[PDB]
Design a protein around this ligand. Structure first.
Ligand SMILES: Cc1cc2nc3c(=O)[nH]c(=O)nc-3n(C[C@H](O)[C@H](O)[C@H](O)COP(=O)(O)OP(=O)(O)OC[C@H]3O[C@@H](n4cnc5c(N)ncnc54)[C@H](O)[C@@H]3O)c2cc1C
Ligand SMILES: Cc1cc2nc3c(=O)[nH]c(=O)nc-3n(C[C@H](O)[C@H](O)[C@H](O)COP(=O)(O)OP(=O)(O)OC[C@H]3O[C@@H](n4cnc5c(N)ncnc54)[C@H](O)[C@@H]3O)c2cc1C
Ligand SMILES: Cc1cc2nc3c(=O)[nH]c(=O)nc-3n(C[C@H](O)[C@H](O)[C@H](O)COP(=O)(O)OP(=O)(O)OC[C@H]3O[C@@H](n4cnc5c(N)ncnc54)[C@H](O)[C@@H]3O)c2cc1C
Ligand SMILES: CCCCCC/C=C/CCCCCCCC(=O)O[C@H](COC(=O)CCCCCCC/C=C/CCCCCCCC)COP(=O)(O)OC[C@H](O)CO
Ligand SMILES: CCCCCC/C=C/CCCCCCCC(=O)O[C@H](COC(=O)CCCCCCC/C=C\CCCCCCCC)COP(=O)(O)OC[C@H](O)CO
Ligand SMILES: CCCCCC/C=C\CCCCCCCC(=O)O[C@H](COC(=O)CCCCCCC/C=C/CCCCCCCC)COP(=O)(O)OC[C@H](O)CO
Ligand SMILES: Oc1cccc(O)n1
Ligand SMILES: Oc1cccc(O)n1
Ligand SMILES: Oc1cccc(O)n1
Lengths: 403, 400, 405
């Protein structure tokens, strides 16, 4: 039919809803739409970062979020053949509160939606699939979406906050400056052994594969086996049995779980892709932000916090434009002009870290020892601060501080 | 006053092997030494696969094994009590190769008993040489005191690293390296351990080296920086015992009866190289008097003995030709230059792993771990242990 | 102000500028090349080249003509660690063809191109002509304003204006261009000394020493030029300590230089070079405008890639302009194809240069392990791929046949 709004946003994920929550708080009619029927449709992680704690306390939101179901992870350890080689406590990085946490996204997103539904100028729809852009007069006017249990949404600003797989990246002719994919992860969950804590963050450098252990919702532990691009098809050929013999040789504590495994149906494959669009704001009334604009690898648990920080900067930029009645393409490029420095700093670190997961004949046996040497450098704590903490709060107007 | 044709000053490994190899050749050979017996001063017990190679070329391997010795098949390196490097010396070459715990006196005496059968061989004890009869630019012999002006065509010095003939001769030290120590002590073999072990440990406080000794007994050398032992003595023995016992918990029994440092022997790991081994006509320097090395790899005894073989071959060649001049003696340094210089350069690279600096001490175990995983470490193993080709000497020097 | 009318306008008569002019002149397009200097000998811009340069020359039937000039081939590069060699590389194994580093100087090569080009009547080159501004009309950049000296003021017009000045570019800011990246972390200190007796002449050597890192290259006239690597801002402190202290440390590292340093009693001999790397965001931004060369994609002086990398951009630029003229399509969309094709190699090189510049650290504990890490990396089973990517080009540049002499 026909709809009217001030700001149109595609997707209600961490970045989309944080932007929608804030923009409504500034007294602008917002619309946020998503295709899934709820927040539980797709699994999208549970771990967070110290940088996330900093952001919430910046807006006076930690107490509200901290009242949810979460488990504070106090440190990260790295092993090599079952012997610890590196330890890092997150509270020695910044004076204020600092810690990782296990906070599932649907828990976090429901907390944001509940706070946002208090405002009457915030509107969220679901099962709403954007399918086209209403670009007219050169500028962008809005989007065309089909709703489920056909409508045109016209707005002054359109923001694309879909995920890696972005439809809004192609309708607006955006171009990628980077396309990295060299590794996989193979995730499975198993019952916590009696000798193990629960709020752990453990990485193992073993003989055959590399393992990452994180807490899972419900007293379980989720493991991830690091593999190369295309090596999983070969693994399945050799059979499940040979996979078990090599895993149990690595981590014998997993003996009890693998007694009841007879197929590759308990494992889930994840592809570690990194991306970067060339120019996020390219057309009038158009912008791109989030993980459709600058994804990163699974290391350090930076993906969600980095996306949320981009939205917060986008809200301040948009707020300045609306008050000044200046929404030209010139004002939109401030998001990239302010986020670029910290997003590219993060991505270059992810490229360095991904070089330690090599499975090559001679490099596989020295990666653990290179890691052990690097972490003993006198100025390694600066890298820790860059990866986990943020030096200064995002400079945005006080109007965004919740009371 | 006694005349001879060859005068060797010192009867160590290098000196004796030169003397025997010349007495068998029908020359008048006299060997001088100062100690009252071969047992007075400790001079090591371990050997390397090059040592077996030298014997089998000389066809004396069977005779040597007839005397007492133990076999040490591999060498292992650990880090915080986990093995990081392993090597078997029998895979380095097709021929049979091993380390031997053959103590020196049971080797020197075996050389003496075999050597004295020849009537032109002569040996003396307590004959401390004092001056050289350097006359007309050449050595007429040596002046000594017994407890003698012995004139010879060649006067070869095998005194050792603490050489007294490095000053009588006007030799110049091309190198002098000294930046580490060792602290030796012997204790009883633990039940869980074996006897024929060659074990090196990278630990938190100190690095240790375990070797066999005395039969059912083990010796351990604690690596310390130069000038650092004088501090452990100033800070008391109680501190030292606790630090060792934390690092190496299986020493708890031996240290329960230790109350002082009088049982600890300080070995100074020195390395040296002479600018020109034979600078004047009539005398030459060979062995550890000229090209000593560090204790790593047990390459010292073989290096000095192999050079004595080179000296004997050249000396016999010169005698057969009757052309014994300055350029003749230089043939020894010309032919041993490649091995002696490559071996020392390796000893300098390994010594760099014994750093005790605040942050380097914790990276050195990791570097060693990486270096052993390189695509070509086995060529370095051969360089350190086995000789690629047999020493080129005429067939007359072999024993049937 | 007197007027001039041409078809293609280029600013600067360095390697990239001159090369592009020659290739455009051969096609029948009127070409004007402008330089501010008296001649090609005014500024000093190095004397070394790369196997990539040989590949580019012979692709256009030019190796023989260049080989006529005076040049000494360099067969290999060595890297030492305390007077001990830790790496060796002969350029002949990189590709099946003939590959090598020469030491041809720039004013020699530039004259070789100049004389060849001026045979075409459509080629014109001016000295002492300095560009001042950009003549933009009707939402386009048509021509420039230049002031000539031995005359007066000139007003050049063309369908295309190309920016081929150096890193210190005026066209960079006259047409407002944006630097995506800029990097500066090190300095080099160059001085020339008489070749010692034992050292050869056609050497390309690098030393990891106790105090400083030394690079030794050949110089014109049987001399040797040496560059000492220093951190940014460390040279001011070095001068404060004194010349006598600086000499003491250098002789410790390289005692072979003792004979040369007797006549050194100040810092007048030394020359300071700043290792700067750049990348222009959008090489083409205004209609009838472009940017190429070190004013676009400068790089650090490691691997001697800078001169050849610019000529690669000029060659692709000549194909870009050629296709537009034959198609009546000199819009911004066609012009942007220059970066769309050059972008890949330029950024691959810039990344390799930042990795290499990490080995020159002078930090208290890092500088003592960099020589050891270099030795570990070069012994990896897959190092030849890096060598091939740093010196040789896998394939020839896909330019038409008309550009072959
Ligand atoms: C398996 C997995 C595990 C992860 N684990 C972690 C972790 O532990 N920690 C962490 O920090 N990050 C993690 N991430 C990354 C995390 O998902 C991102 O950081 C975050 O989701 C980015 O926020 P966003 O706004 O882009 O959300 P999005 O996920 O992009 O939200 C939009 C959603 O809508 C979907 N969509 C696509 N097209 C449309 C359309 N036309 N209309 C509506 N919706 C559409 C998208 O696919 C997406 O699911 C994980 C990701 C994956 C895939
Ligand atoms: C404490 C110690 C432990 C060692 N342990 C080992 C080991 O385990 N394995 C190994 O392979 N190598 C070991 N070595 C090295 C070994 O000593 C040499 O390889 C070997 O001694 C070299 O032989 P040489 O005859 O040149 O020197 P040496 O034989 O050692 O030199 C000393 C000899 O010269 C004689 N002498 C000294 N001064 C005079 C003089 N003025 N006149 C006459 N004769 C004189 C002495 O009586 C003595 O016989 C050790 C060395 C030392 C110091
Ligand atoms: C000290 C030094 C040493 C070097 N050594 C080497 C080496 O060994 N190997 C190598 O491959 N590369 C070397 N280079 C880099 C080399 O100079 C470049 O690769 C090459 O010059 C780039 O070509 P270009 O077309 O940009 O030439 P340019 O040098 O850019 O040619 C244009 C010239 O005109 C000047 N100019 C500035 N403004 C104007 C104007 N308005 N009008 C006219 N002219 C103007 C520029 O400063 C420049 O000198 C060196 C550079 C320096 C500074
Ligand atoms: C020394 C300066 C220049 C020397 C004279 C010029 C001579 C030219 C020829 C020399 C060729 C260089 C060979 C060095 C090998 C090298 O750099 O390998 C590297 C491989 O090793 C790496 O990935 C290392 C990346 C950065 C290394 C940091 C420097 C190491 C030492 C510095 C201080 C110590 C800090 C680090 C602590 C511990 C490190 C683990 C290149 O990797 P890449 O990913 O950039 O490229 C690989 C592929 O081509 C595409 O990705
Ligand atoms: C390993 C996967 C995840 C591990 C645990 C997950 C989460 C925990 C967080 C732990 C933090 C990880 C930090 C690791 C340390 C690290 O990256 O150090 C790096 C080491 O510094 C480097 O430049 C080294 C580059 C990485 C080397 C390549 C990887 C080595 C692995 C095997 C290949 C063998 C190549 C042979 C040697 C190459 C020459 C060095 C610092 O990053 P940087 O590039 O910014 O360095 C600049 C400067 O030189 C300082 O060194
Ligand atoms: C450690 C005391 C004794 C140990 C056991 C005794 C008996 C057994 C013998 C053990 C075999 C020796 C191991 C091999 C290691 C070794 O020296 O080989 C290495 C081979 O390693 C390589 O090629 C990689 C180069 C870098 C690896 C480290 C080797 C040298 C390191 C020096 C200092 C190490 C301390 C680290 C801390 C200091 C900095 C923070 C070098 O020998 P090289 O002759 O090739 O020298 C040339 C140049 O140095 C580069 O190659
Ligand atoms: O569950 C997950 C998946 C990927 C990364 C991470 O930190 N956690
Ligand atoms: O006691 C010693 C001395 C030197 C070498 C070695 O193996 N043992
Ligand atoms: O003299 C020069 C200057 C820059 C780079 C290089 O290789 N040589």
């Amino acid at each position: 039919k026909e709809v009217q709004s001030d700001v149109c946003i595609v997707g209600a994920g961490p970045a989309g809803m944080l932007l929608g929550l804030l923009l409504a708080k500034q007294g602008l009619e917002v619309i946020v739409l998503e295709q899934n029927g709820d927040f539980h449709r797709e699994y999208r992680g549970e771990i967070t970062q110290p940088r996330f704690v900093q952001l919430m306390k910046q807006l006076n939101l930690l107490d509200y979020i901290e009242s949810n179901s979460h488990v504070k992870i106090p440190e990260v350890n790295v092993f090599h053949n079952n012997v610890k080689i590196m330890q890092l406590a997150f509270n020695t990085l910044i004076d204020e509160e600092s810690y990782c946490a296990r906070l599932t996204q649907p828990t976090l997103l429901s907390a944001l939606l509940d706070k946002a539904k208090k405002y009457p100028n915030f509107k969220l729809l679901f099962n709403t699939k954007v399918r086209d852009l209403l670009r007219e007069d050169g500028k962008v006017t809005g989007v065309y979406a089909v709703a489920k249990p056909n409508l045109n949404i016209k707005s002054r600003v359109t923001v694309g906050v879909d995920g890696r797989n972005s439809t809004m990246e192609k309708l607006g002719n955006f171009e990628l400056e980077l396309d990295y994919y060299d590794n996989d992860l193979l995730w499975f969950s198993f019952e916590k052994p009696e000798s193990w804590d629960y709020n752990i963050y453990h990485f193992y450098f073993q003989k055959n594969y590399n393992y990452l252990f994180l807490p899972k919702l419900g007293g379980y532990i989720q493991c991830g086996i690091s593999l190369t691009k295309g090596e999983y098809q070969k693994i399945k050929k050799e059979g499940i049995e040979s996979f078990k013999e090599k895993i149990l040789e690595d981590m014998p504590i997993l003996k009890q779980h693998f007694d009841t495994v007879t197929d590759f149906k308990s494992f889930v494959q994840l592809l570690c892709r990194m991306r970067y669009i060339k120019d996020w704001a390219k057309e009038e009334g158009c912008m791109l932000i989030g993980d459709a604009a600058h994804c990163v690898t699974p290391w350090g648990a930076v993906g969600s916090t980095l996306a949320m920080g981009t939205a917060v900067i986008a809200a301040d930029v948009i707020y300045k434009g609306f008050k000044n009645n200046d929404l030209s393409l010139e004002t939109l490029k401030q998001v990239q002009s302010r986020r670029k420095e910290e997003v590219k700093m993060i991505q270059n670190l992810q490229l360095t870290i991904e070089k330690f997961l090599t499975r090559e004949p001679i490099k596989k046996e020295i990666a653990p020892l290179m890691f052990s040497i690097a972490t003993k450098m006198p100025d390694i704590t600066n890298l820790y601060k860059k990866l986990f903490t943020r030096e200064f709060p995002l400079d945005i107007d006080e109007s965004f501080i919740f009371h």
